[PDB]
Amino acid sequence: IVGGQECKDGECPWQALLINEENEGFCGGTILSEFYILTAAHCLYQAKRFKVRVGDRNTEQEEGGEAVHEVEVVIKHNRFTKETYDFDIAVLRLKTPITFRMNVAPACLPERDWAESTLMTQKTGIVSGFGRTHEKGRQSTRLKMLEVPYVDRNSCKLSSSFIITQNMFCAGYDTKQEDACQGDAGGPHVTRFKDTYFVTGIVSWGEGCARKGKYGIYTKVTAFLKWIDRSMKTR
Amino acid sequence: ANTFLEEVRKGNLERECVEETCSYEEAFEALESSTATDVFWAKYTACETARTPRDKLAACLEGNCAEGLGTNYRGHVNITRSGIECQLWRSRYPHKPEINSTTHPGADLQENFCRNPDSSTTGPWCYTTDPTVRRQECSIPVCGQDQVTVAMQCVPDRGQQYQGRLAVTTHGLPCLAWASAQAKALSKHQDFNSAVQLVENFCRNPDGDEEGVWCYVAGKPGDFGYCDLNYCEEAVEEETGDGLDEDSDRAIEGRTATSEYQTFFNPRTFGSGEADCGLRPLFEKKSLEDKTERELLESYIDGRIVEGSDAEIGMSPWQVMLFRKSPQELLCGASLISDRWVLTAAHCLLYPPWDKNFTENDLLVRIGKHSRTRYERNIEKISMLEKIYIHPRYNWRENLDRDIALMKLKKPVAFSDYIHPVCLPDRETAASLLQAGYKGRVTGWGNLKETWTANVGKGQPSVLQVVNLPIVERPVCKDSTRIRITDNMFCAGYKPDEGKRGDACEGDAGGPFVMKSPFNNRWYQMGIVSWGEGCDRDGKYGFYTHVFRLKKWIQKVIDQFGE
Ligand SMILES: *[C@@H]1O[C@H](CO)[C@@H](O)[C@H](O)[C@H]1NC(C)=O
Ligand SMILES: *[C@@H]1O[C@H](CO)[C@@H](O)[C@H](O)[C@H]1NC(C)=O
């Protein structure tokens, strides 16, 4: 989270801290149900052993609502290839039941047609997580959130040396230093609609953090809503 | 007041102060402030002996006058008695000032103006921009009259084709003859370029040694000293491929490489450990793509958000962390090419004029460690010191440039799983990287920062903060931080958000910024950390030194054991 400000207590409930063997978040987590956590499938290449400390608000110290949850199994996409930049999504079934409480409330799927007609057609989107407070600044001690706007397809294509597929879309600022960064690995990025935030995607890659001419390479949630549900029912 | 027409017109400071004499309360009412009136009265007092005529008083109001001590001087003057431009008072270049910004702000120092912190008798002074003079007193004119309070070459290819005959070095050590018997033997020891000459005690470079011009000096046969001379500055990013010719389109992440290495030293003169650098015994000998932190470049789906959140044991097998006989601490950060030699910085050893409390028995080494406590026999090895050799391009009066040194250990050359050197080939694949845009990483442990700046309210972290400063164009380094950049001086960084602690400056000196290549499998090194302005200070670019100019003198170091 380059720049930005802290998630107020309860403002980012689905947001989770995937605590690894050393219990420090190697990835941004996303509460999905009483037993499920969402992260990008890139997080699977960074794990010795890992848990989900839902409700965490400060990496410095435990300050309320921190319940440790253990991933039962990961639903990795079978077409998930790093080169495609696509399907970078890993649904994390949990052994420990997620207890819906303060700072614990997931983000569920809207109508696929309505999501395509409304979610990706919005103006800005909100990203949260214990991310790098600057492009390279230190990881956000507090749970810091940030809002980023949508980017046109051609702008993302010219702004990327690589493919901008039918799903991936840029979101951020042309030169302003504010976006998701190291710490938002699978960090939940949402979009407000009548106070109901909708996860419109999560950065996968990109040149630096909110660099000049660069943007977060988000994943079109509406593209794989059917796959998101089928992985909700998978494993 | 005395005149009733005064109160008829509303209060305007002119009518009380210029027309007649204005007291403290009347000037207070007219100025509607107390501190402003006090400052006006102080600048008024500056011309207590110089109130006549009025232009003199105006000169006092604008200032630019410091008679006697000058600690109260708040004017606008750059010129010294000699005439050299003053160093930027906010900056701390090109030396270590014992009047740090956290001790004596009493000067009211400003970057573009002279001040007097110590209340010198001659008047306000400044540190010289040039290294010729340690400090020059700011000659400031007197108010009202035009009188002062106190009376008023580059080297081609780092010496490959140089012909200068200078003998005196920057520190002062005389040089030994290049024609001496030991130097004549070293002429056969070191492969010299056929079109270069070496005579007498002049700073030469017959072997393409990019260290700049260095002369054999007295003491150890082969000890090197640098004649005091200036050097140019160059830029690299402005060139595209040239004879490079690797690809037609653009791709920055996701590349794999496997190849061999070409050496620059005679194998008989370096022994084991020459053509194996740039790799790791565990990770790169198997030639396998490794874990999270190195995955940032290689993962196609990942280029900005990887954030492994940890730096586990042995992530820097070629980094050195010194102790002294003083309470356990690192004087000058260093990196490892082999167990026998440690590439420390030359600043710490020889700063004070007396040149003491920096000796051989003090320094101990441990290499390739996550934290400074844990150690095992198969991780690294420790041995005593015999003699330490210093860099004759450094002193308490000089500009601290080329701050690098070594240390002569006892036990012979050896490697381990967490000990492996780093290779440094030519600029071909470096240009491939420049026109392909690949990312890298830097290492350290974070104690040189503690030696140069102090932490209050938060303990010093014993773990390296593994956060990367990517490659940025040189002018960004030049204007982000204002220490002059020599020809042996490297720069790197990212578009920063000020206010937070330095991201990769959390570390030590000699911290290698190692960066993947597509044609070598050996991640390239470009800079060795040195005295940093934005490093030793808050949240700016950390400094490095050009490793391309630090890659030729290592050949003869091991043979003194065999001499
Ligand atoms: C002093 O030098 C500064 C550069 O920092 C310049 O801007 C300023 O005009 C100079 N002032 C005088 C009085 O020489
Ligand atoms: C080392 O420096 C200290 C200052 O704390 C001094 O007292 C001591 O004598 C020095 N050691 C020498 C001069 O051998």
Curated annotation (Swiss-Prot), chain A:
Resulting phenotype, E111A: No significant effects on activity for cleavage of PAR-2/F2RL1
Outcome, altering G172S: In FA10D; almost complete loss of activity
Residues at the catalytic site: H42 (charge relay system), D88 (charge relay system), A185 (charge relay system)
Effect of R138A: Reduces activity for cleavage of PAR-2/F2RL1
Effect of E21Q: Reduces activity for cleavage of PAR-2/F2RL1. No significant effects on factor Va (F5) binding and activity toward prothrombin in the prothrombinase complex (F10-F5)
Disulfide-linked positions: C7-C12, C27-C43, C156-C170, C181-C209
Outcome of substituting G28D: In FA10D; uncertain significance
Superkingdom to which the source organism belongs: Eukaryota
Impact noted for substituting K76A: No significant effects on activity for cleavage of PAR-2/F2RL1
Protein name: Activated factor Xa heavy chain
Native source organism of the sequence: Homo sapiens
Higher taxonomy: Eukaryota, Metazoa, Chordata, Craniata, Vertebrata
UniProtKB/Swiss-Prot annotation, chain B:
Residue positions where 4-carboxyglutamate is found in the record: E6, E7, E14, E16, E19, E20, E25, E26, E29, E32
Start and end residues of each stretch annotated as High affinity receptor-binding region which is also known as the TP508 peptide: 492-514
Keyword Calcium recorded: yes
Annotated phenotype, changing R372H: In FA2D; Himi-2
Residue numbers marked as site, Cleavage: R255, T256, R304, I305
Reaction it catalyzes: Selective cleavage of Arg-|-Gly bonds in fibrinogen to form fibrin and release fibrinopeptides A and B
Family annotation (Gene3D superfamilies): Plasminogen Kringle 4, Thrombin light chain domain, Trypsin-like serine proteases
CDD domains: KR, Tryp_SPc
Root EC class: hydrolase
Similarity comment: Belongs to the peptidase S1 family.
Protein name per its UniProtKB record: Prothrombin
